[PDB]
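Dear all,

This email documents one entry for the complex benchmark we are building for the journal club exercise. For each entry we list the sequence lines for every component of the assembly. Then comes the predicted three-dimensional structure of the complex as a token string, followed by one or two observations. Please use this as the template for your own entries, and keep the labels exactly as they appear.
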Amino acid sequence: ALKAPVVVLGAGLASVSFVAELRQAGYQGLITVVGDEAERPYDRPPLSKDFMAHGDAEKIRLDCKRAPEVEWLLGVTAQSFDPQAHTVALSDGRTLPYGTLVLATGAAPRALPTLQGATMPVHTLRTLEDARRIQAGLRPQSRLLIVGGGVIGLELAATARTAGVHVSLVERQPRLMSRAAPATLADFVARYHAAQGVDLRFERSVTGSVDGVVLLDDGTRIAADMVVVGIGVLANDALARAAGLACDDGIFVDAYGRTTCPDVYALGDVTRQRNPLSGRFERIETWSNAQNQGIAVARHLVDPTAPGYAELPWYWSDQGALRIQVAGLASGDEEIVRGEVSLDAPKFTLIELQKGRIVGATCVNNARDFAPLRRLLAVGAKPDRAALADPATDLRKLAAA
Amino acid sequence: ALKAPVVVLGAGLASVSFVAELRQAGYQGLITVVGDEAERPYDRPPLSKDFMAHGDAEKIRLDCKRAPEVEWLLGVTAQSFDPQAHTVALSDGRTLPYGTLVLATGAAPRALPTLQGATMPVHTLRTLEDARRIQAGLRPQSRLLIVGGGVIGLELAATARTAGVHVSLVERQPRLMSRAAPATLADFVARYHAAQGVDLRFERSVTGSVDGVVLLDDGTRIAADMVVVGIGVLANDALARAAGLACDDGIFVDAYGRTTCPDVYALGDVTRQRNPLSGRFERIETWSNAQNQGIAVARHLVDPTAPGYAELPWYWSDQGALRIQVAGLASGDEEIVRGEVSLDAPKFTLIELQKGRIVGATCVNNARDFAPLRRLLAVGAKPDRAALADPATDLRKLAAA
Ligand SMILES: Cc1cc2nc3c(=O)[nH]c(=O)nc-3n(C[C@H](O)[C@H](O)[C@H](O)COP(=O)(O)OP(=O)(O)OC[C@H]3O[C@@H](n4cnc5c(N)ncnc54)[C@H](O)[C@@H]3O)c2cc1C
Ligand SMILES: Cc1cc2nc3c(=O)[nH]c(=O)nc-3n(C[C@H](O)[C@H](O)[C@H](O)COP(=O)(O)OP(=O)(O)OC[C@H]3O[C@@H](n4cnc5c(N)ncnc54)[C@H](O)[C@@H]3O)c2cc1C
Ligand SMILES: NC(=O)C1=CN([C@@H]2O[C@H](COP(=O)(O)OP(=O)(O)OC[C@H]3O[C@@H](n4cnc5c(N)ncnc54)[C@H](OP(=O)(O)O)[C@@H]3O)[C@@H](O)[C@H]2O)C=CC1
Ligand SMILES: NC(=O)C1=CN([C@@H]2O[C@H](COP(=O)(O)OP(=O)(O)OC[C@H]3O[C@@H](n4cnc5c(N)ncnc54)[C@H](OP(=O)(O)O)[C@@H]3O)[C@@H](O)[C@H]2O)C=CC1
């Protein structure tokens, strides 16, 4: 079942969470983690916010305290694994044996093919190294072009604007945050960023670039000092594909984290997995999934009577004045709006229903309502829609029933 | 690896092919097959053609000669399996032990929700029982409505027209065969069926029905004596889902037929698997996949040095005067047309290319060209596009190089 020794590939949040849970659950056998970045394991969300702005990496490290007696092979790349021999080949020339192999290799940013041969700075934002490079190439009154209106681009937009950087943003879709956000939220978010001076360009794609100017598909030009591309990520599933595991931009796993290869597990951003709400497989890229799927897989490995991973997806995104929280599905057959949707001290809550049942929720600058909404979502609650809209209703009270 | 005893769930083409290959490859341990239909195992394509027209089921049975010493439990439903206990629970009250479990349970037709409460005959066409019922409810000059312009509906359309049945066909898409057919082929096929008297209704959906009349979304009505619904199939993956395997309208498998559950394999229509051409996972519903994936999985189970399943997808469809064969992707960046596309003695070949490389092909009434085109497709050939178009070119010769 859980067979020693355990080897984990990747040393991000998912991996750290997994190995800390193994220890906490009582596994005392060998754990070796292989991490290609030569960095003390660290959390990524500050890279678009407080780290980007203030630059102290020692405030963003992950705590490995709950993972004692782990050897972390930092700055080392796993090059292949042989699932028959039960071995992993490392870039430093060593080989690791394993009883259980855990793939927690995450995802890497998609490149924009039309900027491949560019002769101006073009960066993506995923690592400490990326953050440091983008940080050092921006100055107040510089001109930053962001490609992609996802949460990373928008988080960077906010931070750049606060620093006095002029920001343009090109998005292929008619709206921002098309991945996992209610249209009502996306529209408001566009309203917010436009008011903070972001120059938004919708339904535009980059067709190429020439000597410091980016070219768009509507025949026009944008001049920038730097391009940051944030058009999503792609699973780091190369080792899995080579070794014969089922993959498709992500390693297919069940609720136990099992791949199609015996004794090989996967978790976090690298996985394609079931979303219990939609009942479909999806590659979930959220911080909460990385942590929670990692814990769930570990728990069940040590104690096979534990249930499989069962959490419903949620995320937050901090974008300047907007502290955004989103849980569940972006849409249902009904949206209930609690509060006013206003740039004047923004504060509101959205609730998505499907046939009377809560299937998703959004809070903007309203954390207190988000926890109880997540509880209602989990148990498939069907509150009175009238009470859901009524400002006088205590969602915390409601949730407690 | 291959651990006795072997239990297979489902007794269709995929299952028969799998168990015959196990025997041929040298496995001599127990094989028990559980098949819910109380029928000698049989092939389905004649159900829309020669069986529908002539009604002799003894011409459509699968040969189990190459699968000696197999117990076929016909008319028995597997209700669950316990992958820990390594047992399968049967509807007759018995339990089967297994060393290796193989899920070959196929797929069932999708129902049309707007006809659920209908009070006129509404059938789907998948089994011998379906065929017999549709057969007995049609008469010459009866009015048949077919919902769905896939190969099954079109095959039935042809057979019904030949029998003197009036046929209407409603399709949601602007074209027929939207699943896996080049647009050039689909357009011609519509031309053919219209000329044979089929009343085609595109971009229409059924909204319901009232007392022998079907209602459409454009506010209109179609009167028919019988509706046959052919809007695709859904994987029979219930046992897999309950048992904790990764599934999403189909059981995820790698090229060895492995699911995410140790000692459980799956093959045929029930599987979601990698299409090597598109590099994406797909549920492939072709006869050739059922047979060939079943053989490939068996071969590798007996002999683990054998390669995994590697075939590229292809199918045929016999529709009246049109003997259609299609291999690979429906489209690339270029289509080459060999011959004239004409209702006057139809005979032509399409070739789809992607950056010089053959990625798909179609033959209509030209079997001799289809085999060599499949060989060129397999090795990713890049023939001179000029020679591909030139009528004087021998594709068989070309393929032999
Ligand atoms: C700029 C930024 C802002 C973010 N803000 C938010 C946010 O507002 N909200 C939110 O929910 N999430 C946010 N995220 C955080 C995010 O969701 C987590 O970082 C992520 O989900 C963690 O997943 P992971 O541990 O599986 O993968 P990763 O963090 O990618 O870790 C995988 C590691 O494995 C390494 N690796 C890959 N292949 C190999 C190999 N062969 N050998 C060794 N190592 C290998 C990778 O390089 C990587 O270091 C943000 C991320 C970024 C980059
Ligand atoms: C009308 C018709 C026309 C066709 N014509 C074409 C064609 O022109 N071209 C083409 O390429 N293909 C055609 N097909 C044939 C087709 O592609 C094959 O029949 C199919 O791919 C076989 O897949 P299978 O063996 O995996 O599944 P199936 O044939 O569905 O066999 C699975 C069996 O398992 C049974 N089962 C499911 N659950 C359980 C359980 N819990 N316990 C026991 N048994 C269970 C099912 O009832 C079924 O009998 C046609 C099919 C039909 C119905
Ligand atoms: N469910 C989840 O997994 C969610 C994850 N997050 C976060 O998302 C982050 C990563 O994604 P991010 O970088 O922000 O970008 P996104 O994945 O959000 O994508 C942003 C936009 O880029 C567009 N795009 C994608 N591909 C291309 C392309 N080839 N050319 C031009 N445009 C393209 C997309 O449009 P289009 O749709 O047309 O391709 C999309 O509108 C992760 O860090 C994660 O934390 C946030 C919410 C939910
Ligand atoms: N690659 C493969 O797997 C292929 C399999 N085949 C054969 O396909 C057969 C089964 O499919 P078949 O029954 O013919 O139908 P199809 O899967 O071909 O679908 C036919 C049409 O039905 C429409 N449709 C689907 N769902 C609905 C719905 N809920 N309401 C209204 N219309 C809908 C589809 O449109 P829409 O797209 O909008 O949903 C589609 O255009 C199998 O027997 C197999 O042999 C043939 C070629 C390739």
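Observations: Chain A has three domains: 1-106+235-313, 110-232, 314-401. Residues A 110, 148-153, 171-173, 178-180, 205, 230-233, 284-286, 313, 315 surround NDP (ligand 3) (CB under 6 Å).
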